[PDB]
Design a protein around this ligand. Structure first.
Ligand SMILES: [Mg+2]
Ligand SMILES: [Mg+2]
Ligand SMILES: [Mg+2]
Ligand SMILES: [Mg+2]
Ligand SMILES: [Mg+2]
Ligand SMILES: [Mg+2]
Ligand SMILES: [Mg+2]
Ligand SMILES: [Mg+2]
Ligand SMILES: [Mg+2]
Ligand SMILES: [Mg+2]
Ligand SMILES: [Mg+2]
Ligand SMILES: [Mg+2]
Ligand SMILES: [Mg+2]
Ligand SMILES: [Mg+2]
Ligand SMILES: [Mg+2]
Ligand SMILES: [Mg+2]
Ligand SMILES: [Mg+2]
Ligand SMILES: [Mg+2]
Ligand SMILES: [Mg+2]
Ligand SMILES: [Mg+2]
Ligand SMILES: [Mg+2]
Ligand SMILES: [Mg+2]
Ligand SMILES: [Mg+2]
Ligand SMILES: [Mg+2]
Ligand SMILES: [Mg+2]
Ligand SMILES: [Mg+2]
Ligand SMILES: [Mg+2]
Ligand SMILES: [Mg+2]
Ligand SMILES: [Mg+2]
Ligand SMILES: [Mg+2]
Ligand SMILES: [Mg+2]
Ligand SMILES: [Mg+2]
Ligand SMILES: [Mg+2]
Ligand SMILES: [Mg+2]
Ligand SMILES: [Mg+2]
Ligand SMILES: [Mg+2]
Ligand SMILES: [Zn+2]
Lengths: 275, 88, 96, 65, 115
RNA sequence: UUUUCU
RNA sequence: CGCAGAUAUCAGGAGGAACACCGGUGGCGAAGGCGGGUCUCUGGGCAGUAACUGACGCUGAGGAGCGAAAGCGUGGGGAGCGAACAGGAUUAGAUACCCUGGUAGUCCACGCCGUAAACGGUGGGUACUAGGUGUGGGUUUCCUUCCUUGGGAUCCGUGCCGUAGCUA
């Protein structure tokens, strides 16, 4: 759900927050959590790799299972849905019949007290897994594997979805969330359904602290920048920089995909903005 | 819609004698049961504005009949009021 | 407690003998719930007007039952859930 | 105008079961004939229409094949 | 290539006509149109252009060796009779005639009127 | 096709 | 828009809106309006018996509610159609009538505004005043097959033509 604050202080006017009507617990299993440390956005050398990224709040990582082929043909039960900051969407706790406990992304429309099939010949119930070769055409899927035994490395954010087109030989066609079409071996695994919590977009923050806790630092505009540290800097007054916009490091906009990539001569087409 | 069984049972319960059917008391009993179960339907069915029109018409009829019973005799009026548990 | 007439169309791959056992198994729940009266008739294997679920044959069965709306709705849901069937129709036998 | 044969007490019951009577009141194109031609009363015409429509939906008559 | 049985698809719009000969299973063998014949402008609507296109298509079909053909015709009537007669006279015989036009079931919305 | 003003 | 493989045709899949033939100067609702099919709940109307209440009837300033399409707020979906805006063609001038593209909107859920030639341009209730001619529903009686717009009597709704009267 979505809740909107009633304005009572100048800073909070227009703020909103997502109503967590889908959570059942607020305590991850002690055996499945692993620690994590504040990182700061630097690297081994210590140079600032990406500007204005830092600060925030201490977070504890929880392990997730993106393999889902070690266990096959054994049913599972949906137990609980848990809070998770590390990724945009919510997650679910699974109880396998043999007794193991495991974690997966919470698909849209799922609720407590249900049955999930993970067999290679399982049903079309949402949240199930089975190889691309065995999925009927026209269904919506997520957690796509870029290739067999590679783990779900695509379409993991909230509200994303993939649509399955026809099939050919060992190849299948997928509609990318951004309109692209890509081919992948049918031997890989995937999951039916889409990521829930589709109301992520409508969140209005309106407060500096709500960004600082997440760890976003100011941006400092270009024109105000002094000429030495910037290409637009300098000038008396304020101007457009006296030169067509260029990155702060000398290289302008335009082509950004490295040509002659092994996928360059195999993949079909590119995006089109705002059709 | 009320059926023969329950309607006859209300009539026997609230009738002045075994034969009267158009008595004001039997009338009010039937109308209150109709209104009650119908509004029970409408608190789950939202936008049946025709049923809303029916509500208004039947409530007005009840009001007018209650006014008539009060005019003719107010002792029966107060007695009926405290028996049925209505306000006015 | 109203007279109901139902027809069910079944796919052709199954044999004719196994049909009825399934019917009584399905309707046992209504039999044990409201103590209903049922009559059955089986006659099928006729040319279909058009194509349904990539099948060109079907089996027509008609059953007369008197039960609750809840029971008949549950039966309809279960039958539609089952894969062996294609389509189900239910209608009142009285005026309404 | 020819009389409505269904107003008689000897007329058969109206149902979607009898393909013969379902078909004899429609043209070869599969469309429902007009009142002016069939010469039936409004009630019987409407019951025939609903019965035929249910039959077409349950796939006993062609969709104008 | 050789096939004993054939199927013809013909349709005349308000300002165009096209004819195609297809394998009963669906695969096409040859096609022709007044555009290929070499008429430009509003001349498309003239039935004579449709006759020429039909003659060219029939000659190509005979080149490939088609003997009997079935007709699945549609579209508004512009060159119906002339086209069918020319197809008959080109050397091919038609067994059955069927008119299958796509009739919408009061769906979508038609375009506005012309003023 | 279009075709202003007294 | 294509010659990077269009139009066309055969197979399969995805998705949104609306339901032709029944279908009409026919039916229903107070008016707006209303029809693909099945299931669940619900309102009103008419004919007869006439068992019951025993004048309990009409009206209605202010007041409350409903109320065509268009428009606004919050959130989704968007197949077709398409205000605004681009271009093409005619005209001396086109900011139009013609054509190719297309953003709100047309849809859905929750609140809003309460407006039309909302016309039968003719308020509601009551009793009376020549007929002929169609149409829907319910009861009765007789040629009587007792099938049958055969005919007779009666209540309600809906069309046309017609005297006395009224009307510039
Ligand atoms: Mg750790
Ligand atoms: Mg160094
Ligand atoms: Mg930065
Ligand atoms: Mg610190
Ligand atoms: Mg998350
Ligand atoms: Mg703020
Ligand atoms: Mg900046
Ligand atoms: Mg500065
Ligand atoms: Mg410099
Ligand atoms: Mg420096
Ligand atoms: Mg400067
Ligand atoms: Mg200056
Ligand atoms: Mg500037
Ligand atoms: Mg630049
Ligand atoms: Mg991109
Ligand atoms: Mg009937
Ligand atoms: Mg023309
Ligand atoms: Mg047009
Ligand atoms: Mg095509
Ligand atoms: Mg109106
Ligand atoms: Mg009713
Ligand atoms: Mg009496
Ligand atoms: Mg209102
Ligand atoms: Mg509107
Ligand atoms: Mg606006
Ligand atoms: Mg709006
Ligand atoms: Mg929007
Ligand atoms: Mg689309
Ligand atoms: Mg222009
Ligand atoms: Mg236009
Ligand atoms: Mg357009
Ligand atoms: Mg006005
Ligand atoms: Mg009057
Ligand atoms: Mg009359
Ligand atoms: Mg006169
Ligand atoms: Mg006057
Ligand atoms: Zn009849």
């Amino acid at each position: 759900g979505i809740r909107k604050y009633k304005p009572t202080t100048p800073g909070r006017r227009g703020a909103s927050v997502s109503d967590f009507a889908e959570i059942t617990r607020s305590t991850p299993e002690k055996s499945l959590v692993r620690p994590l440390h504040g990182k700061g956005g630097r690297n081994a050398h210590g140079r600032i790799t990406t500007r204005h990224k830092g600060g925030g709040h201490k977070r504890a990582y929880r392990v997730i299972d993106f393999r889902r082929h070690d266990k096959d043909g054994v049913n599972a039960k949906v137990a609980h849905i848990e809070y998770d900051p590390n990724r945009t969407a919510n997650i679910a706790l699974l109880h396998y019949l043999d007794g193991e406990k495991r974690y997966i992304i919470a698909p849209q429309g799922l609720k407590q007290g249900d049955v999930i099939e993970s067999g290679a010949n399982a049903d079309i119930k949402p949240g199930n897994n089975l190889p691309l070769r065995n999925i009927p055409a026209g269904t919506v899927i997520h957690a796509v594997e870029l290739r067999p035994g590679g783990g779900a490395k695509l379409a993991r954010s909230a509200g994303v979805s993939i649509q399955l087109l026809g099939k050919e030989g060992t190849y299948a066609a997928l509609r990318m969330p951004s309109g692209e079409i890509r081919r992948v071996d049918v031997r890989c695994r995937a999951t039916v359904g889409e990521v829930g919590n589709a109301e992520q977009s409508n969140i209005n923050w309106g407060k500096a602290g709500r960004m600082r806790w997440k760890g976003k630092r100011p941006t400092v505009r270009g024109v105000v920048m002094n000429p030495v540290d910037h290409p637009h800097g300098g000038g008396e007054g304020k101007t457009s920089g006296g030169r067509h916009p260029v990155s702060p490091w000398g290289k302008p906009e335009g082509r950004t995909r490295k040509p002659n990539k092994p996928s360059d001569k195999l993949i079909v087409r590119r995006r089109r903005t705002g059709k | 819609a009320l059926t023969a069984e329950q309607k006859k049972e209300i009539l026997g319960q609230y009738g002045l004698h075994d034969t009267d059917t158009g008595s004001p008391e039997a009338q009010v009993a039937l109308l209150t049961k109709r209104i009650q179960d119908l509004t029970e339907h409408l608190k789950v069915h939202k936008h049946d504005h025709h049923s809303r029109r029916g509500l208004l018409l039947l409530v007005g009829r009840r009001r007018r009949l209650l006014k008539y019973v009060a005019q003719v005799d107010v002792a029966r009026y107060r007695s009926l009021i405290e028996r049925l548990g209505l306000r006015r | 407690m109203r007279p109901y007439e139902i027809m069910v169309i079944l796919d052709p791959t199954l044999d004719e003998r196994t049909v009825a056992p399934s019917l009584e198994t399905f309707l046992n729940v209504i039999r044990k719930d409201g103590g209903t009266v049922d009559k059955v008739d089986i006659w099928g294997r006729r040319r279909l007007a058009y194509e349904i679920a990539k099948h060109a044959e079907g089996i027509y069965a008609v059953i007369d039952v008197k039960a609750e709306p809840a029971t008949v709705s549950e039966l309809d849901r279960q039958l539609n859930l089952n894969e062996s069937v294609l389509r189900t129709k239910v209608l009142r036998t009285d005026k309404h | 105008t020819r009389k409505c044969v269904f107003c008689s007490k000897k007329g058969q019951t109206i149902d979607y079961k009898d393909t013969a009577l379902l078909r004899t009141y429609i043209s070869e194109r599969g469309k429902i004939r007009a009142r002016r031609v069939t010469g039936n009363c409004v009630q019987h015409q409407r019951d025939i229409a609903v019965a035929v429509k249910n039959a077409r939906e349950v796939a006993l008559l062609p969709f104008g094949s | 290539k050789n096939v004993p049985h054939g199927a013809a698809h013909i349709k005349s719009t308000f300002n165009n006509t096209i004819v195609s000969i297809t394998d009963p299973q669906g695969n096409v063998i040859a096609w022709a149109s007044s555009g290929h014949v070499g008429f430009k402008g509003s001349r498309k609507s003239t039935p004579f252009a449709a006759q020429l296109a039909a003659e060219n298509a029939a000659r190509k079909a005979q080149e490939h060796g088609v003997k009997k053909v079935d007709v699945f015709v549609k579209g508004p009537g512009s060159g119906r009779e002339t086209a069918i007669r020319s197809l008959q006279a080109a050397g091919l015989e038609v067994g059955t005639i069927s008119d299958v036009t796509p009739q919408p079931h009061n769906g979508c919305r038609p375009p506005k009127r012309r003023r």
